[PDB]
A paper describes a structure:
Most diderm phyla from the Terrabacteria group have recently been shown to lack well-characterised OM attachment systems, but instead have OmpM, which could represent an ancestral tethering system in bacteria.
The pseudosymmetry was confirmed by enforcing C3 symmetry during data processing, which resulted in a better-resolved β-barrel region (2.8 Å) but uninterpretable density for the periplasmic stalk. The β-barrel of VpOmpM1 consists of 16 anti-parallel β-strands connected by extracellular loops and periplasmic turns similar to the E. coli porin OmpF. The eyelet (the narrowest region of the pore) is formed by sidechains projecting from the β-barrel strands into the lumen as well as sidechain and backbone atoms of the constricting loop residues.
Author numbering:
A (entry chain B), B (entry chain A), C (entry chain C): 113 to 420
Amino acid sequence: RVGNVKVTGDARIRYQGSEDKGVYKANSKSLTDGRARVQFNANVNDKTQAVVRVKGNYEFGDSTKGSQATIDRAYVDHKFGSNVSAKAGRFQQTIGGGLMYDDTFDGAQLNVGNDKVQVQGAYGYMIDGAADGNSKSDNPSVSYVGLKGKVGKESSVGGFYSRLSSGNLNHNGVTVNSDKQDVYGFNADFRKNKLWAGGEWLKASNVDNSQAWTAGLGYGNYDIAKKGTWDVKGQYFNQKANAPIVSSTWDQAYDLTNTSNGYKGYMASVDYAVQDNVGLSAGYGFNSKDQSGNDLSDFYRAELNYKF
Amino acid sequence: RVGNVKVTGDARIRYQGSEDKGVYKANSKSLTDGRARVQFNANVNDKTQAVVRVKGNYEFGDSTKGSQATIDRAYVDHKFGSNVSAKAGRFQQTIGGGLMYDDTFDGAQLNVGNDKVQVQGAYGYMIDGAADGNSKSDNPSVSYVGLKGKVGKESSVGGFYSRLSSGNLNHNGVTVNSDKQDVYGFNADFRKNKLWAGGEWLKASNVDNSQAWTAGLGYGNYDIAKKGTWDVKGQYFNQKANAPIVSSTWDQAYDLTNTSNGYKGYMASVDYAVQDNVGLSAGYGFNSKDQSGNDLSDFYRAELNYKF
Amino acid sequence: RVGNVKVTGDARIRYQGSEDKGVYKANSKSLTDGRARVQFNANVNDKTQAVVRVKGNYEFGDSTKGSQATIDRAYVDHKFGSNVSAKAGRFQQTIGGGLMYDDTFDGAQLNVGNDKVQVQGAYGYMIDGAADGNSKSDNPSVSYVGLKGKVGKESSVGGFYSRLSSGNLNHNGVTVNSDKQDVYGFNADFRKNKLWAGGEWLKASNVDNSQAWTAGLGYGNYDIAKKGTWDVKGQYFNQKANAPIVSSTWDQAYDLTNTSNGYKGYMASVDYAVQDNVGLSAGYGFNSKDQSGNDLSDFYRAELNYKF
């Protein structure tokens, strides 16, 4: 009865809030929602594997529509030896350290690794974030190349260079057409014992006021599979008005789709594995301001993550 | 290749009809449809489990839209010992004996059992029935507490008290805003040998003409997993105009969404397991009348249930 | 952890193009898309099985909407002995050799085989093709009976007779109501060693200019599960203006929904299994013309199929 497909997944019960209305839910300052994902990992052969993930989001109490299931991921991974790998279809792409974009991606990905230095090249389109709601003609294409070297036993540094074509992006709720963008950046990720010190800087060369950077300190040994593991970190975000932030890997409430004059503030988050494969995560963004000094709304998070 | 997720499901081919048009399908007196559900039961750890169910409904011959898959269930079950259990997310809630509501429920559920007496407390929102099509602000919240005691070896009696906040409910196809409702009720379920005698009574204290009750007799040993098992029962429904019937557990064609002056009539249903995990079910509602004596339309059912 | 359900599926990355715009994508002459399907094969009992398939289509770069998951197949298969089989629900029906229709089908199917001669009878509605977008009342019902005999060790010939009721079909993008149609046809499928020579002819007796036929030659031993297997074939299509072509089993770009005066041209396609359960398929339709001699647009195909 067993085949080549292995079924995994996760469940999440998340709470989001803010001191002002509209940050997470329209005309309100709170949002409680749940997520259920089921992933099918299939072994096509010894060197080829295919991953299909079905995802469903619902809001607690929202019965206007059902929780429609959408194919979040659909891609095939090829292992062309021991150092070369390739992806094609609908997968997850991390542009740089994830500050610019870490979300769904349609296209192809090429990997050339050496266990101490890694080269990744991706060509395709972004799906979520400011790239959401764009047709194929209106969606800018991303030609991304990235370098990642291991500076220590587990610390790593790297950089990237990306090229975005003309397309429509969501700027403060308004889709505007932008010219070509050449986005380059660098990142660092140091991890000594339990201490963590990471940072990332990115900028679009041709667009002014496009600089965005982040930096944070952490301490912990969090692992959702191990009970009792905990983590604490506090990171600072400084992104300008024209900084390309489509779907960031971090949990700040402000990106290109929500801000018209950039974002600048701190965020403290904690993690705790209450049980095995069960983790409690909380976050609190404070001192949120625009690049002109205008105060923004403080935001806070609390979610429960179940892994199976 | 095996993980923590076990895949189950069911399939149904159902036929519904009536002597008048509009009871089941608009502008017609018949409805043939099929249902396919796939459920993923996952063991997060020794004391935590998560259930995700994907459901798809289609009509025989309706090709206007595809059979969109919706996440019917998405919840996590915790076992806090041997007597305390907890649920959270999108699950199934039975308010009382199921006459008032037995369908999808967003919120949290707490269980305290003793193997002879059980206490269940739920807080959240109803999704299907008269609560369908309501946003989070317009969906009334349910604060439900229920008691269930075992009066015999397998017979049981119980009661419940529910509190519904202000919200919009579907009354005869029209969504009207209602004030707070305090719904209380009692039920009995006697099962001696093969004979079954059950009944339920519920009423909203502050709303007049809100009384609803049912009673039925049965005889059989139906079990879909066992071939040759059969069941027959005949039950009578008497629900008034303002009686809260959102999504009843029984198969009467008339509830709050379809009736403007209540429902009152009999219903005879039969069950038969033609094969293992295959069951043939039929039903026939007759003598359907309003609370004022106006005749309603007789309805009849026939479905095939496949379990896997 | 293992149950009665076995999980299979497939993934596809397809490219389609033409010399004229609108053949595959509106206002463009190209279309790159991907497909991911997950099928759940369940054993209800020793003689009953149920199949549920979840399907998701996405376009590379189209982020206007998510890849909604739809239940492509939902049906139950019964084995009433060793020669009689039955299907019910949403399955795949091949009307004749597949030239007229080979796609989703709602209804019931009966099979009576003898390992050398087979009789198949289906009653229901077509879902895809020219039958897409039709409600239950507007969808014509198909009463189909088919005969298939084995003329050689692996060659086979057969025929069919179909009866279509009044209903709406998509004719060149316009849904028109048509009277009853009695469609009959014959087919032949010869397979000697690696050579293949097949053909099919169909016609609606009461509709004029409803004749449609195809013929092709092939050579290969293609099997996606075996690496290195390859196939080549070239087939010719001659279908008239009123010929019923709802969802053909072949890959010609022109059918009843796209053509107003029929289709007539050649098509050469190749297959190659680059890896185990991975296959590369290409096609090229050329010399496309109408039944009046007006030139149509040449089309070409290229897809990658992954099986798991």
